[PDB]
């Protein structure tokens, strides 16, 4: 086999549109908004901490304008696959699971419980699985052997 070095990371379409979107429900973000930050038509705060901006927010071109008016030193905000990969890297797994676990018994809502338990089962299966969340973002592209794609 072979490989191709990619300058910029690329999100895998299978995990992007698995229906349900694994990345989308792992980050607890809607499909419409997650599919609007990877195409550079919007913006997103990459684990930034400011007065208003918290960890995750999809700012538009105009919102970024008045965001970057006075401040802009600590809180960062990237855009696209790099930001998504950094978000997947800088999110805890065991801690998030514990929190969700508790909010499972206290919560009385039905639909919420279903959505909560469907999230926690994926989180657990991931934690016993030997995979990493950032591996879902493709960075090196393997190539097929030439004989399997003859000319």
């Amino acid at each position: 086999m072979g490989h191709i070095e990619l300058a910029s990371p690329t999100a895998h379409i299978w995990f992007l549109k698995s229906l349900p979107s694994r990345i989308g429900l792992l980050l607890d973000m809607p499909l419409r908004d997650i599919e609007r930050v990877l195409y550079f038509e919007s913006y997103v705060v990459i684990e930034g901490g400011m007065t208003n901006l918290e960890r995750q927010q999809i700012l538009t071109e105009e919102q970024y304008l008045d965001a970057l008016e006075e401040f802009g030193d600590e809180f960062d905000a990237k855009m696209g696959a790099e930001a998504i990969q950094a978000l997947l890297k800088s999110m805890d797994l065991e801690q998030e699971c514990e929190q969700l676990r508790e909010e499972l018994n206290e919560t009385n809502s039905e639909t919420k419980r279903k959505k909560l338990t469907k999230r926690i089962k994926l989180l657990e299966a991931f934690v016993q699985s030997g995979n990493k969340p950032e591996w879902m973002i493709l960075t090196v592209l393997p190539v097929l052997p030439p004989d399997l794609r003859p000319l």
Binding site: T51, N52, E54, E94, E98, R101, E102, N108, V127
Partner: protein, 189 residues
Amino acid sequence: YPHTQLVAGVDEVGRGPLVGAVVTAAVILDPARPIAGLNDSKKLSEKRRLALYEEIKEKALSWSLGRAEPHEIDELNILHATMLAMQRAVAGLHIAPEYVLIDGNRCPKLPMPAMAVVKGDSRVPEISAASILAKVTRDAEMAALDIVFPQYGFAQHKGYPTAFHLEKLAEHGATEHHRRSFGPVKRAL
């Protein structure tokens, strides 16, 4: 809001941990000294959260802390120990509230009227302020216990039953602070 001026918000932390108290706070905010950027304590960065501590405590009309130790949790169970903690928090307020807003879906027995608010921490500034005070206090106690019992790593997992905490609980056994009624702690004992 109720048609009252002295509304207290109340929230809890440390429901699921295997170690230390359940901690609650009660807060009456000052309408003349509003606190900007109150929101669920979990969504806040640690720096911002601790920053609020010097604003909440300064700008609130009244605040207080109520706790329930591991032994009281083992005797009462976690639900009634949370209700007791909450009571103390509300009972510790210098200024008596006219009305109490509690995070979740149950109220403790109180001498004043009270309402349970589901996700009140995200909807009610006073419950958000209580969430921050309770969380910061609790997290500092887990850091203090980590200094005394460094082999458990209490500063990192804040006493929650993480794989690491369960491993260290099996290796070193349960400490006096370790809630003795929780299933993992019963097994280690």
